[PDB]
Amino acid sequence: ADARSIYVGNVDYGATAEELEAHFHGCGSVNRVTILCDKFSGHPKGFAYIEFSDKESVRTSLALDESLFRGRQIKVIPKR
Amino acid sequence: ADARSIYVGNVDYGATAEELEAHFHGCGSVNRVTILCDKFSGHPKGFAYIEFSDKESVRTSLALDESLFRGRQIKVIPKR
């Protein structure tokens, strides 16, 4: 599961799983979206895990590193 | 951390951490909100963890079991 997952940095407290899936939908079938937020107002502090159905989607999704999601650049790496 | 946490059942793919914190804000200071979704369209399938700053907020938050959040009744229990 972690081998089929990416970490997505710079995700805010207004993000939804539907929005995240929609951002990564072209990379492959998504199994689970986990959003983790440590701030709920003011400057955001959080990230997400996207778990793809197939391992191959992970490499594909790396092209979305630095993409704009909800008005800010996201960091995309394989889940550490 | 798990001793300071609740499981929140029946959370949809349109929920945000800010909305969840706002629902539980009266129970005590929140440290982290984790949203976990297995469906991103159609009938939702997901849940959340709310990690409170203080253990005492967990018992308090149990009163919000069956409360309406985003138009549906949520299930609130101490994180298993």
Q: Which residue is associated with the tokens 């502090």?
A: A45
Q: How was this structure determined?
A: X-ray
H or E stretch at B78: strand B75-78
Chain A residue numbers with beta carbons less than 8 Å from the beta carbon of B40 are 17-18, 21-22, 30, 33
d(CA A75, CA B21): 25
Enumerate helices (H) and strands (E) in chain B, giving the number of each.
2, 6
Tell me if residue A26 falls in helix, strand or coil.
helix
Assigned architecture for domain B1-80: 2-Layer Sandwich (3.30)
Domain extent listing, chain A: 1-80
Contact between B55 and B47 (Cβ < 8 Å):
no
Numbers of helices and strands, H then E, in chain A:
2, 6
**A17 with B34: Cβ contact below 8 A:** no
Contact B1, B65 (CB under 8 A): no
Residue B65 sits at φ, ψ, to 5 deg, of: -60, 135
Q: Name every residue whose Cβ is closer than 8 Å to that of residue A11 and which is 6 or more positions away in sequence.
A: A20, A35, A37, A44, A46, A47, A48, A69, A70, A74
Q: Does B50 touch chain A if contact means CB atoms closer than 8 Å?
A: no
Residues A22, A28, A32, A37, Cα dihedral to 10°: -50
Report the distance separating Cα A26 and Cα B56, nearest Å: 44
Do A13 and B21 touch, CB atoms closer than 8 A?
yes
How far apart, in whole angstroms, are the C-alpha atoms of residue A12 and residue A26? 22
Q: Do A17 and B30 touch (CB under 8 A)?
A: no
Write out the H or E segment, with its range, that includes residue B50.
Answer: strand B46-52
